[PDB]
Short mmCIF file of C-alpha atoms in Angstrom, two decimals:
data_model
loop_
_atom_site.label_atom_id
_atom_site.label_comp_id
_atom_site.label_asym_id
_atom_site.label_seq_id
_atom_site.Cartn_x
_atom_site.Cartn_y
_atom_site.Cartn_z
CA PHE A 1 -30.43 -4.58 18.96
CA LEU A 2 -29.23 -1.15 20.03
CA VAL A 3 -27.46 -2.31 22.64
CA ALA A 4 -25.84 -5.34 20.90
CA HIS A 5 -23.91 -3.34 18.87
CA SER A 6 -22.95 -0.84 21.25
CA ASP A 7 -19.62 -0.22 20.04
CA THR A 8 -20.68 1.19 17.08
CA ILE A 9 -24.06 3.30 18.15
CA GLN A 10 -21.66 5.08 20.09
CA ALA A 11 -18.93 5.69 17.34
CA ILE A 12 -22.00 7.10 14.88
CA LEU A 13 -23.20 9.65 17.53
CA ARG A 14 -20.07 10.96 18.72
CA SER A 15 -18.60 11.21 15.29
CA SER A 16 -22.53 14.92 4.79
CA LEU A 17 -25.99 13.91 3.48
CA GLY A 18 -25.62 10.30 3.96
CA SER A 19 -24.26 10.78 7.91
CA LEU A 20 -27.36 13.27 8.51
CA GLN A 21 -29.46 10.44 6.94
CA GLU A 22 -27.99 7.84 9.19
CA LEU A 23 -28.50 10.11 12.17
CA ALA A 24 -32.19 10.25 11.38
CA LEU A 25 -32.91 6.41 11.31
CA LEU A 26 -30.85 6.50 14.50
CA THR A 27 -32.67 8.73 16.62
CA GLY A 28 -36.20 7.37 14.78
CA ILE A 29 -35.05 4.29 15.89
CA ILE A 30 -33.83 5.01 19.18
CA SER A 31 -37.13 6.98 20.49
CA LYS A 32 -39.19 4.48 19.20
CA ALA A 33 -36.87 1.93 21.11
CA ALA A 34 -35.17 3.63 24.00
CA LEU A 35 -38.14 3.01 26.36
CA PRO A 36 -37.31 2.45 29.97
CA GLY A 37 -40.63 -0.03 30.04
CA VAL A 38 -38.27 -2.39 28.35
CA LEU A 39 -35.63 -2.47 31.27
CA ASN A 40 -37.48 -4.06 33.59
CA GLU A 41 -39.08 -6.90 31.67
CA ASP A 42 -29.86 -5.20 36.92
CA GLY A 43 -26.82 -5.97 34.60
CA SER A 44 -28.90 -4.95 31.68
CA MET A 45 -30.99 -2.18 33.92
CA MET A 46 -27.75 -0.49 34.24
CA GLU A 47 -26.16 -1.53 30.46
CA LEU A 48 -29.51 0.17 28.67
CA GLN A 49 -29.36 3.10 31.35
CA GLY A 50 -26.19 3.85 30.23
CA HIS A 51 -27.41 3.82 26.66
CA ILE A 52 -30.20 5.74 27.37
CA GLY A 53 -28.24 8.37 28.42
CA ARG A 54 -25.40 8.27 25.98
CA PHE A 55 -28.55 8.91 23.36
CA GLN A 56 -29.49 11.79 25.83
CA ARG A 57 -26.19 13.37 25.33
CA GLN A 58 -25.29 12.72 21.99
CA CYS A 59 -28.78 14.50 21.06
CA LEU A 60 -28.10 17.64 23.08
CA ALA A 61 -24.70 17.85 21.01
CA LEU A 62 -26.64 18.75 17.91
CA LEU A 63 -28.42 21.39 18.99
CA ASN A 64 -24.92 23.39 19.37
CA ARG A 65 -24.08 21.97 15.73
CA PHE A 66 -27.28 22.89 13.62
CA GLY A 67 -28.84 25.64 16.19
CA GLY A 68 -25.76 27.53 16.34
CA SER A 69 -23.19 29.83 14.51
CA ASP A 70 -22.07 26.52 12.57
CA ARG A 71 -25.10 26.14 10.91
CA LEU A 72 -24.02 28.50 8.43
CA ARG A 73 -20.42 26.77 7.93
CA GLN A 74 -22.11 23.68 6.62
CA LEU A 75 -24.27 25.28 4.50
CA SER A 76 -21.70 27.51 2.75
CA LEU A 77 -18.98 24.55 2.47
CA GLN A 78 -21.81 23.06 0.37
CA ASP A 79 -21.78 26.28 -2.18
CA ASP A 80 -18.46 25.86 -3.60
CA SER A 81 -20.33 23.21 -5.78
CA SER A 82 -24.36 23.19 -4.07
CA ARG A 83 -25.57 20.97 -6.67
CA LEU A 84 -29.62 19.02 -5.89
CA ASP A 85 -26.88 16.85 -3.42
CA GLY A 86 -26.22 20.04 -1.17
CA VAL A 87 -29.97 21.39 -1.00
CA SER A 88 -30.80 17.77 -0.07
CA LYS A 89 -28.04 17.69 2.54
CA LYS A 90 -29.43 20.69 4.29
CA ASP A 91 -33.15 18.91 4.44
CA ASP A 92 -31.60 16.23 5.85
CA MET A 93 -29.45 18.37 8.34
CA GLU A 94 -32.81 19.59 9.75
CA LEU A 95 -34.50 16.22 9.74
CA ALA A 96 -31.55 15.98 12.18
CA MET A 97 -32.01 18.59 14.16
CA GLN A 98 -36.27 17.93 14.15
CA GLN A 99 -36.75 14.42 13.89
CA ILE A 100 -34.08 13.45 16.70
CA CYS A 101 -34.96 15.87 19.03
CA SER A 102 -38.85 15.60 18.66
CA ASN A 103 -38.50 11.90 18.71
CA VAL A 104 -36.23 11.70 21.99
CA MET A 105 -38.48 14.89 23.57
CA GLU A 106 -41.68 12.98 22.62
CA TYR A 107 -39.93 9.84 24.42
CA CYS A 108 -39.21 12.30 27.56
CA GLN A 109 -42.87 13.50 27.32
CA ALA A 110 -44.08 9.53 27.30
CA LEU A 111 -41.83 9.07 30.00
CA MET A 112 -43.12 11.98 31.89
CA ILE A 113 -46.67 10.77 31.39
CA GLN A 114 -45.92 6.84 32.68
CA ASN A 115 -44.66 8.46 35.98
CA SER A 116 -46.40 11.22 36.21
CA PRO A 117 -43.38 13.66 35.86
CA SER A 118 -41.79 11.74 38.89
CA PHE A 119 -44.73 12.47 41.49
CA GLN A 120 -42.12 11.73 44.61
CA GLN A 121 -39.59 14.42 43.19
CA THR A 122 -40.73 16.39 46.36
CA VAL A 123 -36.84 15.86 47.32
CA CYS A 124 -35.39 19.38 45.99
CA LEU A 125 -35.01 18.87 42.34
CA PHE A 126 -32.58 22.18 42.49
CA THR A 127 -30.20 22.97 44.43
CA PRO A 128 -31.21 25.92 46.89
CA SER A 129 -28.57 28.21 45.03
CA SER A 130 -14.73 9.93 28.56
CA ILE A 131 -15.61 5.92 27.84
CA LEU A 132 -18.49 4.21 29.05
CA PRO A 133 -17.13 3.42 32.84
CA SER A 134 -18.78 0.81 35.24
CA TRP A 135 -21.38 3.40 36.66
CA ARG A 136 -21.72 7.55 35.85
CA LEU A 137 -24.21 9.51 37.36
CA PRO A 138 -26.25 12.13 35.29
CA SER A 139 -27.28 15.71 35.74
CA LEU A 140 -30.74 17.28 36.17
CA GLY A 141 -29.83 20.87 34.60
CA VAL A 142 -29.13 19.30 31.78
CA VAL A 143 -33.00 19.58 31.49
CA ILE A 144 -32.89 23.47 31.80
CA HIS A 145 -30.77 23.41 29.07
CA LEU A 146 -32.11 21.15 26.89
CA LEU A 147 -35.56 23.61 27.62
CA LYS A 148 -33.13 26.79 27.13
CA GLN A 149 -31.75 25.05 24.02
CA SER A 150 -35.40 23.93 22.26
CA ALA A 151 -37.04 27.21 23.05
CA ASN A 152 -34.04 28.89 21.11
CA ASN A 153 -34.17 25.99 18.55
CA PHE A 154 -38.03 26.69 18.16
CA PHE A 155 -37.29 30.18 16.84
CA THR A 156 -34.75 29.47 14.24
CA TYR A 157 -37.11 26.77 12.96
CA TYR A 158 -40.43 28.82 12.80
CA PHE B 1 -23.03 -4.99 -33.15
CA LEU B 2 -22.13 -7.12 -29.91
CA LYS B 3 -21.17 -4.61 -28.05
CA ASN B 4 -23.47 -2.05 -28.63
CA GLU B 5 -26.64 -4.78 -27.99
CA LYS B 6 -24.81 -5.91 -24.72
CA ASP B 7 -24.81 -2.49 -23.39
CA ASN B 8 -27.91 -1.29 -24.26
CA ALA B 9 -29.16 -4.75 -22.14
CA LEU B 10 -27.05 -3.87 -19.18
CA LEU B 11 -28.14 -0.44 -19.28
CA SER B 12 -31.59 -1.46 -19.14
CA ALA B 13 -30.66 -3.77 -16.32
CA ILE B 14 -29.26 -0.79 -14.26
CA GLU B 15 -32.31 1.21 -15.26
CA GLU B 16 -34.90 -1.83 -13.15
CA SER B 17 -32.48 -1.92 -10.49
CA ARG B 18 -32.32 1.70 -9.37
CA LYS B 19 -36.00 2.29 -9.82
CA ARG B 20 -36.94 -0.35 -7.49
CA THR B 21 -34.51 0.45 -4.92
CA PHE B 22 -35.64 4.16 -5.11
CA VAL B 23 -38.98 3.71 -5.15
CA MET B 24 -38.52 1.22 -1.90
CA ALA B 25 -36.30 3.37 0.21
CA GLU B 26 -38.21 6.43 -0.48
CA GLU B 27 -41.57 5.13 0.59
CA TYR B 28 -40.68 3.15 3.50
CA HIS B 29 -38.51 6.03 5.18
CA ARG B 30 -41.27 8.34 4.20
CA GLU B 31 -43.96 6.28 6.00
CA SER B 32 -41.98 6.10 9.38
CA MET B 33 -41.44 9.42 9.96
CA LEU B 34 -45.20 10.65 8.78
CA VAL B 35 -46.15 8.23 11.24
CA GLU B 36 -44.20 9.12 13.95
CA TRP B 37 -44.75 12.70 13.92
CA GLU B 38 -48.73 12.37 13.27
CA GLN B 39 -48.87 9.91 16.60
CA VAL B 40 -46.77 12.54 18.24
CA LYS B 41 -48.60 15.31 17.51
CA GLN B 42 -52.42 13.81 18.21
CA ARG B 43 -50.95 11.92 21.37
CA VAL B 44 -49.59 15.45 22.91
CA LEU B 45 -52.82 17.04 22.33
CA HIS B 46 -55.07 15.15 23.44
CA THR B 47 -52.90 14.35 26.56
CA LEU B 48 -52.69 17.92 27.47
CA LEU B 49 -56.26 18.51 26.74
CA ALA B 50 -57.18 15.86 28.99
CA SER B 51 -54.67 17.17 31.86
CA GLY B 52 -55.89 20.61 31.80
#
């Protein structure tokens, strides 16, 4: 179902309390759904490996919108008239940052458990130093950026 | 007054409508999120401990 609407799902992730709540259920649905165990049970194995890599790229793009200096501008722009809506927007702003990432990171952890953190990655993991196309290769330094961002978002979430 | 009567009936109808809506939506999403968090916590903890 997430793939059958791949045009809309990728328009929401690339895009307010309502908007934040949409990002919540989407990522709450993604992480209980975006399981590569579903992939194997290659046209559909690459369609879904492209949707997963889009979720991961778009769930890291929310660490700089909510875990950065732009967290202050999203809270002050509602203080023109900060009703009980604006306070509820911020709770869903956070329930984005907390629930979207935990969900996605829990997915990452489950993936790791299933495959013993890529056991055969004895191949050098580190070097010794756009619309969805037909194919696109991912990056692995993305994991270190996710670590440096999650370790910096932990202290701000604490 | 017919106007008054009908208006009050409509108001009562709008009340029951918003009530159930809010109730169902809240409950459902609260459930889902909490379930997720609890599961995640427990699983992670146990796995880490066993791996240690």
